[PDB]
């Protein structure tokens, strides 16, 4: 029984989207004696997080409306580290991908220590498939699940079929295969996302 921690470290200087200074977290501390107490400011879309429909809608469901039963369940890691530029319907047709599947995608982003602007992303063609195939949720090892797609069709195509999106996974030391996924978000209410601790278990039970 090994736990693989596939969560991104949160710290000032961490890889953030487009390396934008304002997307960086701040931690303030105070030590009155031996008592050390901190406060953290962070974008909900920081490192390992779970997107909610409200991101890409407006009467969109929040983080809260997505049940823990959908996040603390079995999952399948798909190795797409052979993929260049973007994941296409081709790369996900040939994989074991059924209805109510939670698929985590290990791509060459798992191996970038700093932000890469040309990160492998889930194209609309790939997402529209995944939606009509009837997957439960998709995780990507990238802070955003899509780029170079204005009107955000990838995102919109998942959250339309209430498919939970997990961004910011660190899947370097993970082998393609089925695992017990623990995707535990901060119990934030009414928001477009929540930062998450995502663990894999080799439970094989």
Residues in contact with its own copies by CB under 8 A are 3, 5, 7-11, 25-27, 29, 31, 34-45, 47-48, 54-58, 60, 64, 68-69, 72, 152, 182, 184-193, 195-197, 199, 201, 205
Q: How far apart are CA 138 and CA 100, in angstroms?
A: 10
Burial of 88 by CB count in 10 Å (0-12 exposed, 13-18 middle, 19+ buried)? middle
59 binds, among its own copies, Mn ion, none (CB under 5 to 8 A by kind): none
Contacts of 128 (CB under 8 A, 6+ apart): 89, 153, 157
Contacting residue, 140, 167, 181, 196, with Mn ion by CB under 5 A: 167
Residues 106, 174: contact at Cβ < 8 Å?
Answer: yes
Shortest Cβ distance from residue 201 to its own copies (Å)?
8
CA-angle at 175, arms to 83 and 128, nearest 5°: 45
Contacting residue, 8, 46, 51, 107, with Mn ion by CB under 5 A: 51
Shortest Cβ distance from residue 34 to Mn ion (Å)?
12
Q: Which residue's entry shows tokens 């695992």? A: 179
Give the nearer residue to Mn ion in terms of CB position, either 49 or 76: 49
Determine if 124 is a binding residue for Mn ion (CB under 5 A).
no
80: tokens are 């797409």
Shortest Cβ distance from residue 76 to its own copies (Å)?
18
State the residues that interact with Mn ion by CB under 5 A: 45, 51, 167
């Amino acid at each position: 029984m090994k736990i693989i921690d596939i969560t991104a470290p949160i710290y000032e200087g961490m890889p953030v989207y487009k390396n934008k200074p304002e997307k960086q977290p701040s931690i303030t501390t105070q030590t009155n004696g031996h008592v050390t107490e901190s406060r953290i400011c962070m974008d909900v879309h920081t490192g390992t997080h779970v997107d909610a429909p409200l991101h890409m809608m407006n009467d969109g469901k929040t983080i809260e409306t997505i049940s823990i039963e959908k996040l603390v369940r079995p999952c399948k890691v798909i190795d797409l580290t052979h993929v260049h530029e973007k994941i296409t319907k081709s790369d996900v047709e040939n994989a074991d991908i059924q209805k109510d599947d939670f698929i985590l995608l290990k791509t060459k982003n798992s191996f970038d220590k700093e932000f890469n602007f040309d990160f492998i992303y889930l194209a609309e063609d790939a997402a529209r498939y995944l939606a009509e195939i009837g997957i439960a949720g998709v995780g990507i090892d990238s802070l955003g699940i899509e780029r170079a797609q204005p009107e955000h069709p990838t995102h919109r195509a998942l959250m339309d079929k209430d498919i939970v999106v997990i961004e910011g996974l660190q899947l370097a030391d993970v082998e393609e295969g089925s695992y017990f996924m623990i995707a535990a978000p901060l119990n934030i209410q009414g928001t477009d996302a929540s930062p998450a601790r995502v663990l894999l278990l080799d439970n094989w039970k």
